[PDB]
């Protein structure tokens, strides 16, 4: 029953075309609930959930102020890291930031995150002890020194450890009927012939929440994990997810392969077979 | 090393005005909160109001919610507490504290008696 509230920030520099583009997204569990785009004319933290619109105008006044201050901060780190790597000032560069907390089913703190990234690769991160950083390269050692001399990991401690836990346990009761639901998968199986002597078996899983599911193709006990397409858990778009696993079993050998589904919304794993 | 010195409280009539000043010294004032806590005579501690020197966030105790206003001058290391519409129950010893990055007021002042007298 562990729950998490994560915030994803994507600051992309566009030299010669205006200010860097900034996008901020927040997710309780896998349900987005806020949004911020530096191009949208609103220039405000826009709700994206029905259970988050019950927050007074002061919530959206503080939230907008605290996300634009991160937008302007990332607007000066892009120029700072550009010189740190000594790159040309006419190229596009991306700074990504993620943080949040993990709150158990008890409603208590489990783990706090803070992870930055420059150009897709890891840049710096916050260790599980919440007081030490893990620089990823030789340019991030300067940041790790600026963030230790100014106690960046100690001021941030009262947010991941205290503020995220208190504010995430506000969403899990406001969004009680949405975030705290487990919809079981609507599993089914299909046979698509490709040849007279070869065929494929597709094991489906539609409309399950949360997105964490496992589809496996065991052939008489042994789980294959070989020649088994396992496309990523894809969102249906209505707050649920979809996923399917395939296999290239030969014709006439259909009735020896089984599909097992282990979703937390299911009483026990399923044992889908053909027919 | 950190010293919090509070001053400016004394005898005042109900429905009057006071401005309690907490002169912080010993730390970067912009990085720590400054809380005002009052100790009613004989009774226990009661948190009154709060300020965040950077980002300018305030808070009040719902018993001094509309009456008190905290300000803070960053280049004076001095946080103020303006007390309006002072009631007979507002008499106490007012300590100014320091939110110390740990969700705890690690450094406290000394106290400033405020006597609302009719």
């Amino acid at each position: 029953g562990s729950h998490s509230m994560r915030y994803f920030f994507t600051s992309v520099s566009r030299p010669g075309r205006g200010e860097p583009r900034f996008i901020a997204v927040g997710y309780v569990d896998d349900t987005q609930f806020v949004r911020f785009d530096s191009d949208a004319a609103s220039q405000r933290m826009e709700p994206r959930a029905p259970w988050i619109e019950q927050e007074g105008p002061e919530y959206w006044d503080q939230e907008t102020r605290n996300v634009k201050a991160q937008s302007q901060t990332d607007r000066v780190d892009l120029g700072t890291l550009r010189g740190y790597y000594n790159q040309s000032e006419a190229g596009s560069h991306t700074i990504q930031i993620m943080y949040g907390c993990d709150v158990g089913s008890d409603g208590r703190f489990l783990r706090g995150y803070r992870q930055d990234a420059y150009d897709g690769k890891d840049y710096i991160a916050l260790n599980e002890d919440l007081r030490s950083w893990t620089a990823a390269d030789m340019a991030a050692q300067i940041t790790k020194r600026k963030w230790e001399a100014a106690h960046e990991a100690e001021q941030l401690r009262a947010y991941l450890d205290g503020t995220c836990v208190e504010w995430l346990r506000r969403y899990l009761e406001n969004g009680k009927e949405t975030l705290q639901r487990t919809d079981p998968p609507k599993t089914h199986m299909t046979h698509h012939p490709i040849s007279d002597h070869e065929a494929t078996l597709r094991c489906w899983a539609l409309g399950f929440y949360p997105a964490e599911i496992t589809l496996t193709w065991q052939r008489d006990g042994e789980d294959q994990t070989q020649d088994t397409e396992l496309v990523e858990t894809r969102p249906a778009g209505d707050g649920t997810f979809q996923k399917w696993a395939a296999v290239v079993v030969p014709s006439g050998e259909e009735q020896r392969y089984t599909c097992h589904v282990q979703h937390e919304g299911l009483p026990k794993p399923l044992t889908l077979r053909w027919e | 090393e950190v010293q919090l010195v509070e001053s400016g409280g004394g005898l005042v009539q109900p429905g009057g005005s006071l401005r309690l000043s907490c002169a912080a010294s010993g730390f970067t004032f912009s990085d720590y909160s400054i809380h005002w806590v009052r100790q009613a005579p004989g009774k226990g501690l009661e948190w009154v109001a709060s300020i965040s020197s950077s980002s300018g966030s305030t808070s009040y105790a719902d018993s001094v919610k509309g009456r008190f206003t905290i300000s803070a001058d960053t280049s004076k290391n001095t946080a103020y507490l303006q007390m309006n519409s002072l009631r007979a129950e507002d008499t106490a010893v007012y300590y100014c504290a320091r939110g110390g990055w740990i969700a705890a007021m690690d450094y406290w002042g000394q106290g400033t008696l405020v006597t609302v007298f009719n």
Partner: peptide
């Protein structure tokens, strides 16, 4: 809520 206005800058 998003992290406040405390920090330094990379």
């Amino acid at each position: 809520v998003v992290v406040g206005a405390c920090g330094v800058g990379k």
